[PDB]
Subunit: 135 residues, 2 copies
């Protein structure tokens, strides 16, 4: 069934640039948040460009809630890594906040009010999934 | 073959939805939706309502919809002049008073409320998707 005119993104998602974005409608821990995106054959938000950043900043400006991204750190001795295994570059942002070995499942990053913060991965928060748009 | 909706909008069903960039009185909000070849949100069913709440679930802002009336002796009507279908939602808030510029409806935190149309609020615009 080859499509006649496939949309860049699925219904309910938001299209911007090269990607498609899906904002959750509730708050869940990082693990569950990741599972949701994966179940849709997508992934958690990965801010890799200025375009990504500008869009997300404007999109969350309507909220005071924190949104989980696909960025985490096993523990203090490990680096920050995205789900795809690539390192966190210093260009777009730094993760503010504490990382702790006492967190049962590592530390995770979420964006809220423009800035990005570190937090215990087992805590609940909204999240944003992402995937490539059909262009 | 074009995209159903422009970038930044949310495509759902037969329409495209957009959060206004600013907060203005009802009339200005209506004008700004028109300038985007769109109109203020019109809820035709509970499916629409549930979709909208899902979309604004992470926001505490009040968003104007295309529903209003001059005073309490008037029934609520959408911009297009069609009535508010029953069993969609009950309009709460300032529904008994009479304001100079009329009463307008906005959705916030899962419910619909009435309010002086001259007061400000963000809004939701919608327009037919290109299918």
């Amino acid at each position: 069934r080859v499509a006649n005119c496939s949309a860049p993104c699925p219904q309910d998602w938001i299209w911007h640039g090269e990607n498609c974005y899906l904002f959750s409608s509730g708050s869940f821990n990082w693990e569950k948040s990741q599972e949701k995106c994966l179940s849709l054959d997508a992934k958690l938000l990965k801010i890799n460009s200025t375009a990504d950043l500008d869009f997300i900043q404007q999109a969350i400006s309507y909220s005071s809630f924190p949104f989980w991204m696909g960025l985490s750190r096993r523990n203090p001795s490990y680096p920050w890594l995205w789900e795809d295994g690539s390192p966190l570059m210093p260009h777009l942002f730094r993760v503010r906040g504490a990382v702790s070995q006492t967190y049962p499942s590592g530390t995770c990053a979420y964006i809220q009010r423009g800035a990005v913060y570190a937090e215990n991965c087992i805590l609940a928060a909204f999240s944003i999934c992402q995937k490539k748009a059909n262009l």
